[PDB]
Amino acid sequence: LIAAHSHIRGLGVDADTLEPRPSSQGLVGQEKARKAAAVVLEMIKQGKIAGRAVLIAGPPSTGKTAIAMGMAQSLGQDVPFTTLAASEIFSLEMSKTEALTQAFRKSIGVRIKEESEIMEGEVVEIQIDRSVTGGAKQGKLTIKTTDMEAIYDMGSKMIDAMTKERVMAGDIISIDKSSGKITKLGRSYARSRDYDAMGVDTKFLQCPEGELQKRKEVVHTVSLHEIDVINSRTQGFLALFSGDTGEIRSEIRDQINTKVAEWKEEGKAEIVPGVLFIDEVHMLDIECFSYINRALESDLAPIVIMASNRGVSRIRGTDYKSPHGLPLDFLDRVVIINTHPYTPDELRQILSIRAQEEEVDLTPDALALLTKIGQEAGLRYASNLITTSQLIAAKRRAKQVGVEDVQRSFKLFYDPARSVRFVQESEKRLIGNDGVVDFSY
Amino acid sequence: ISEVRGNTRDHRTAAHTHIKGLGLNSSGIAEKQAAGFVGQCAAREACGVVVDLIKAHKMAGRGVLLAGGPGTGKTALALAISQELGTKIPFCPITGSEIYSTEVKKTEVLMENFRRAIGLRVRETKDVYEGEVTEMTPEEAENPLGGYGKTISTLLIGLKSARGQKKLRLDPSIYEAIQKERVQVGDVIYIETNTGACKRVGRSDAYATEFDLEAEEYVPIPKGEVHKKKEIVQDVTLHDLDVANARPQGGQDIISMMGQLMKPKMTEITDKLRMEINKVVQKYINQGVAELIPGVLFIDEAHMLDIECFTYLNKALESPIAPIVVLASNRGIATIRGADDLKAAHGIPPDFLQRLLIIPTHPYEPDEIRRIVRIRAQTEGVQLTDAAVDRVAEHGVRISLRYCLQLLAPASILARVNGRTQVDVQDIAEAEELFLDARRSANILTSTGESGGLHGFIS
Amino acid sequence: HRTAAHTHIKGLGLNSSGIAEKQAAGFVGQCAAREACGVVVDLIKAHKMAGRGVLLAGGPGTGKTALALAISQELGTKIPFCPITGSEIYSTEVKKTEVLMENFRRAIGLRVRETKDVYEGEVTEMTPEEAENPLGGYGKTISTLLIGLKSARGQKKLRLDPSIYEAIQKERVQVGDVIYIETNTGACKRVGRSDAYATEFDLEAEEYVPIPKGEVHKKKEIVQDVTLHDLDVANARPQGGQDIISMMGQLMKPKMTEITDKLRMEINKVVQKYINQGVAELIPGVLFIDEAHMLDIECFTYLNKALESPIAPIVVLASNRGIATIRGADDLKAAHGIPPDFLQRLLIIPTHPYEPDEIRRIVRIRAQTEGVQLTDAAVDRVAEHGVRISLRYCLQLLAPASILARVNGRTQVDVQDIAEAEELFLDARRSANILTSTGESGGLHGFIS
Amino acid sequence: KRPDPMMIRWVNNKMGSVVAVPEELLGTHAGVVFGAGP
Amino acid sequence: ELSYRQRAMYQSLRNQISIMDTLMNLVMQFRKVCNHPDLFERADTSSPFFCGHFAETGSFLREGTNVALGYSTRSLVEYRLPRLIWCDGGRLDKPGPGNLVAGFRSKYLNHMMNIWTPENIRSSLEGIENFTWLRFVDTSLQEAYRASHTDVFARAVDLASKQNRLGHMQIVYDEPEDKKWTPVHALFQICERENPKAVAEITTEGVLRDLMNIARVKYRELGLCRLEKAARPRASAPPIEVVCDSRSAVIERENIMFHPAMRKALFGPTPSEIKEASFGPRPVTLYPPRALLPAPDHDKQRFTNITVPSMARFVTDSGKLAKLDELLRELKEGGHRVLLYFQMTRMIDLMEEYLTYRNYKY
């Protein structure tokens, strides 16, 4: 599916000089902000700096999310990129502080390296002994390559896996002795015909070759929050996915912080600091900000990127207004990146990119009109008309979106400004702020 | 056992029972009176494009606002969309009131409904043998093992369905299931080929007379083929996959079993579960074994959402797998529910309002009211004189569309209790006097409640 | 390796006479406050007084948090330093005064010598013996297990209690395993397979372990560091026994509970016995409540009781506020945001704003700590922002400017790189002007108010 | 050698599959499925 | 460079210098820790602090070869109640002389005047009366009466002895002519008779089955079942006990705190019961059909906080040994397997343990 930021596929900057290109990777304009963001990527990728809070500020639209989403695309898969809407911090399960602590620790990765041994071979024989009316199980697996054959004892856990997988002679299987996962890969020869209900036919494979065992390094990245959850419990690691973690006690996290440092010095773990993107941060309250002040001071703090639309605005949980809706002793810790409203030549480029992403073929006149609509009504509204006009054009079986299709879309769907006028022009027939309304004609 | 009710099975009727669709040409132009709609031609034409947007499955997380006064047909238009899409497309309607759960943060409630609105269709083959067990019979092996009393090479089972008989030459290992399931001759079972095990459905009711007393429920013989291989289509919302992962159902241990016996509170599911679900779902879509069905989340009275709800929907709508969200509002210029000093149009925050395609619904002309009266009358089955249609429509113009429509059922009763099947002005004139409207009743409050000491309204 | 806001602070930088060196241990200035924090350090190390309060009072950025971190380093890792913000007190699971007591008791340490009395060996034989329960309805029960343990030096046969056999069942022990049986808990640990069975031909990654050396029966001496809070919690939600309550307590969701003062006074008596037995020593430490203005009138009222406790820690409060409204007491205003009543209990250490030359010196220390080289023109330019805008702001420029410098290939930051950093990364006040200037107009491009 | 009195053995190979039952289990309820009950 | 373990020891030694500015013994033990911290205080199987009484062994020599290990573990918090309260009718629910209310109230409120007793239910079983639904919820009057009186643990054990037969009907009663057949006595059991889970168990490609397993598959794939525990509780305790000088109090402690039926449910059938169930002429059911204790989430830590040292730590705990290991894993290309020299004899023994861990020959 196509979404609001699907065209954004990077930050669009020269990796050498960090110079923003005027158009690249789906981003247009905002060059100062895109350059400032490119520098923050270097701080993230180097990882040495802890707890720098960057605020992207600007009026609505202007790409504050688009830039932050461009950064996510530039960091790639290994680095954590936790996105919070600030409204997620308010919870009934846990305090706001606990919700912030978890989100901070979600943004720090721990890249564990482990070495595992996998078997692979043709099953030549399988033998299982089962107790009558009881759990006791034992068995032996005879397994083969073109160059080895050996008989392995099976425990109860293997026998459960072996029957879940319906391992039969001639199956090619591999077994990771560390995890105990069994996978079938095919068969060395046809499934025998005498028995019925023998299941779906497999792939063919030639027999595996060389040694049965081989060692294999495997790398797993987990957040510090996952480690918190696993170690706060004997049982219930489902809480990692379910929420339901409660307010994890701080003496557990102290221990985890020490152990992760120990794992790092031992070379067991590589710590991978990522970013917490908080969107619409002006939704946090005064207690949240007082916590974040000092969460940033840890050497395990991620870099925290924030976005706000707000002018001078009231701080939540507070009597008084402040710039961005953020308190001043918080803003003392924060550098601000400013986004700016677009030029018509930028809107034309952005709309062209949206049209390509949505696979919509605008005529040049339709693009000109959409650009003009974009100046009067906003970039989002004009981008919605692209999809609408495509549909309307298709119903009349036109090859391309014409001005006629854009005009009809504009006719059908109200500009956020026209809707405000419509609301004013029917103040008596809409329900007021004091609840009065008239239903009569 | 159950005594079948044979007489009648007629439908009830509710406020929207007449709405049957958007009533649009093949060109998408609205007909002035079709599918139960009268007027709103522009609003119906816009909703027609919305139906085409949804049915095209191209786009995620587009917002639509239905804006207009109370009674102007906004929920009628939403219900018409749901009918235009048909039941294959998910449609999750809520009010903004429904978000304030006591069990979880309201943004979890919003995200739950958000993923109810996304359907997944999965096609798989089901492949089982079924019947009553006619026979069970070992075959000795030709090479019996040393030191063992018996060696069995096959275990024959005869299965009978209503449509055939088959001898299953099963692998000997099925002895395990037969013992543990206690399969007898005459029990109804199935054997599934992906495991080779069996499960006992019950004892066949062909044996319900074996004893005067037995602790058996008897079950009919399967009325399918003895071997059932067919493709099966499974429809699940992505919310069903969330819950199936966050609250696994089948657990055999004491803690699982105590769990399923206690109150099953919902839980604030993590983004990493939902994200991990999304990524595997997308694997199967690329394999072509599943298809995504993006539906509609309809939020009625969206002015009841607060600013924390709206700021979350910003994030939610940006996700690649998201429904179309349709809001409806009627609140003019109003305070945002969570931000007591911000007033905005529709009661929707201006930050969020910029996202929405806005569709206005206008008031109705007197002649549209009269047409609706007749459509509503023929839906409630009320028969009217034309003078009664006029008198009712006059209340529609002077008072409210809803009020005049509501008099038809009272007036129908007052007519038949005078032996008349056709309602006439004399009946309308009695319904309207037994059943006041909001304004005439409010005039009594002003006049009789002019004082409160006794016999006055509490104020 | 990773560098945070306070990585340069190493200590209070005091002489043996207790006088602040004007620049030492990462500090510049605050000399009077560093000297007062020295006397606080000596109050803690004396471990003689309970429940004394200290307020670090002073504007934001004046090093109050640096000083508290310096106290923690002067005390070193033996003493509990328990740092919190006032925002952390607002648990959903338990009342706010509960998390005050938990944190008060995390600040009190205990070092204790423990004897582990233990059995070890390769399991040579294992044989259950049974009770024929006639009418319990649960059927038969195992009455004991006989198990043979072999070490390198000797051998025993143990007739285990049923509750210890349940521990072995949980641990999945089999003949030929090496196991550990702590008689303190009755817990059993499976160490591995005996090395006598060491073979490649098992599908599961078994731990093949050598036979235990020495006697089968041992006593181990271990020195443990615990806080009073760890003892409280251990005894509130017990998990150490092999009884059914302990067993099920390991399966239920972890949950904080409003631990009663009965449990706390009982655990004082337990710890007092360890002290009188000579196996333990008390290590009373310090609780640092940062952002103490974020506490509320109920918290402060509770501290008036809690600080009277004869084993309360030392409490250091920081506040950055002038005359301000007390939270939860909206009619009451007082200095520091602290109630006048509770302020009488504290010793207030005021901290003061820096001079231009101190700021210049902090820039160099901080530049050295982040590992970035500046020209003196660069150091002067950054110091100007510290004077004109804010210390915090000017220190935030060092890392951006280093990248911008390196991008041009120059390894040393010069004025052009700071001049670029100033324009990419605004301070609060340049951003606030953009808000106000644009806020002249609404419409599409207004900031939302 | 003698097999465990309580364990039924399944074994599968290129020739297919067999189950073998201890003579201690023939004449029990477990023998019935093999045609050798009480 | 020293490992963090060595660094901590070396620091604690230079704390001794605060007295001294024994130095010969100090520098000799500085040399030990710089060789390997196990020369100074060898790492060993360890556990949280245990905050409880237990009976310790006073003599190893007199213990002999055969000894009974009783369960001595006891709380040091030791709540003392008079038998007037704990035994002789200060507990309201327990009948006896001096608690004449409890025996009456037990009978009348749980049986006589109890809506769930089968004689009461059967009067309300019809029409619009309050147990009218019972006809269709797949439970007997006996089962309704059991579920109202047994606690959620006891009910959960009984629930182990049940079959998902309504889910199997979904597999079998499938064609339109089966009319989604459901036993009329199970008519209201709607969500059990139809849900996707049962079908997904049976399809030949487990697409909907895999989708429902993602969370637990991902958990195990990350290895979080096998990763070392990064934290544990620092102290551990057994439950608090009442101390009351009565034999009844001691009996009651065994009945509740070591509750036989709960334990039997958790750990399952005994070996004699498995024999009697297996050799009998007819099948027989077992009180629990299986052990109902869950599988542990951690495959190695299981249900205990005991931790065992490992050879991985052993190598890295000495900076020299870690460095030596890296160069030995290349000098293996040259040989020199025993070209190593030591100033301490025990260091040679530790090196044998390391070499055998590496399987390097002497």
Ligand SMILES: Nc1ncnc2c1ncn2[C@@H]1O[C@H](COP(=O)(O)OP(=O)(O)O)[C@@H](O)[C@H]1O
């Ligand atoms: N400079 C830009 N280049 C490309 N797309 C942009 C740019 N700015 C905004 N957009 C797009 O327009 C929409 C609005 O921008 P968004 O980033 O959501 O604004 P906000 O700053 O309010 O979060 C998004 O779909 C985004 O992809």
Ligand SMILES: Nc1ncnc2c1ncn2[C@@H]1O[C@H](COP(=O)(O)OP(=O)(O)O)[C@@H](O)[C@H]1O
């Ligand atoms: N165009 C229309 N044609 C037929 N019936 C309508 C029309 N508009 C509204 N109604 C009916 O009149 C009533 C008011 O419409 P409704 O959708 O409830 O208004 P709203 O949602 O705006 O409050 C409903 O019973 C509805 O079915």
Ligand SMILES: Nc1ncnc2c1ncn2[C@@H]1O[C@H](COP(=O)(O)OP(=O)(O)O)[C@@H](O)[C@H]1O
């Ligand atoms: N005297 C000082 N010497 C060196 N660095 C200091 C000094 N005072 C403050 N800093 C540093 O300046 C920043 C602000 O100080 P901080 O303690 O956070 O102020 P606050 O009183 O608001 O806590 C921190 O990075 C801190 O390390």
